[PDB]
Amino acid sequence: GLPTMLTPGSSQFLTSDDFQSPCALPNFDVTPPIHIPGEVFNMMELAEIDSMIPMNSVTGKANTMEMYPIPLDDKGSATPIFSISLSPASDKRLQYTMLGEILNYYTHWTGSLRFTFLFCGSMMATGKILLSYSPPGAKPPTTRKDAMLGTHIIWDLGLQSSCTMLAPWISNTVYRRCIKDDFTEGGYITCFYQTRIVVPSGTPTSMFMLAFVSACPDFSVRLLRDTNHISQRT
């Protein structure tokens, strides 16, 4: 025989190995392929689809359809409308979005996050809303005058129903970790009345908006891992 010498690794089963193996059904004639709509090539294609943030997952609304709609009214309170950390894998509200679910199969993420808001009041309701992203390392914003010092957009409610706020990729590390982590903290997303919602008479004075999250084309993930979102009894 050809003289050979076995190296370390010999006979191991590495579950991420990539070797050939003999076919149990040789000369098998596979069913011819046909075109099927909706072919997927990359999990990041799915990450670019908007899914609803369960933004109002408070006691009595968590695990109901009422966890999604963000309460709005015509009272013009100075208190924030919602506040959430840019922790898209680990946050109690972001982790169950389509993007969150994909991120929980990976260890590392990079790129820009898109937050799209749909106003679902009456056509007769007007308003201006400030949407802010504050990169980390300063007092988390709880007032409009702190929020407006960060990355922000002033949304005018009107015929165009929806407004997109970006959390642009602003990070020390080239990747953040898909866990709660001080070192790779992402910062603070907040929302304030810029003016107030105004309605005429005979119109609902309370209403909702829906918040969606998706990945931008600059977004990628690394280091495949098991998710903490599925388990079974043994």
Binding site: T15, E39, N63, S112, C216
Partner: protein, 281 residues
Amino acid sequence: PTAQSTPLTSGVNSQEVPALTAVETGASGQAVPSDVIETRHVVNYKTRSESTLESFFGRSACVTILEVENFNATTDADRKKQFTTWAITYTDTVQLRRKLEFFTYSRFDLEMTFVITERYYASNTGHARNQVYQLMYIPPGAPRPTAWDDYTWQSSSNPSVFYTYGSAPPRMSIPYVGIANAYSHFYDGFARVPLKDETVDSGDTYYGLVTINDFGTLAVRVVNEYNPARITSKIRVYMKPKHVRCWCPRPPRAVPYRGEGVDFKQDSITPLTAVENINTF
């Protein structure tokens, strides 16, 4: 091919309003940072290599644990411990199943790997010679064994692997074997149409993929006759989808499975932990 670079952009004062849209259309938000902030040029050298379907599925996952024993069996129950049969499925475990169920349809070849372990049942019953295992793939229709040493194990046509304890985990490839042009992960239907005034039972019939799926049976035995020492074995079955295509993405499983279907369990349908307030960082 890389993920998107960021172009150098300054401000705008314009009738062009990329920040506004209407998601009623069924389009997701499309705006990127250069649409709503001043951006520097950043060259992106990073790739989506590890989120291709081949990369996402490129792992051998445990799909079941089988048990077989080798001892002098004197009862029907003990004779049935000398071999095991398993209807081939990915629904005994949750991890690979959940990944596949991001998709409605798939087409792949399968790498199957096995990990075989033993222990002595007792001491002071002497020892056991090294055991050889037979893992026989029984396609639908082929006769199933009723004893560890019946005629079916001669396996003239069924593929069998003979594995020697202590050797490298055994492994073989299976082609895409579906009778359709893809595997269905979900089937919204029945195996037959129940007809007006027929006498056939409609009270105990099932629904979905369980009514139509059949990938045959894995039969496992220890080939050796019994030693004085009873040996108990586990066979862990591993599947890796390779040469993968998938169609029609789905929301992933959010709550525990309770069987082969999409059914959920009343005590396990509250996946979210309530936040203290809508304003909690």
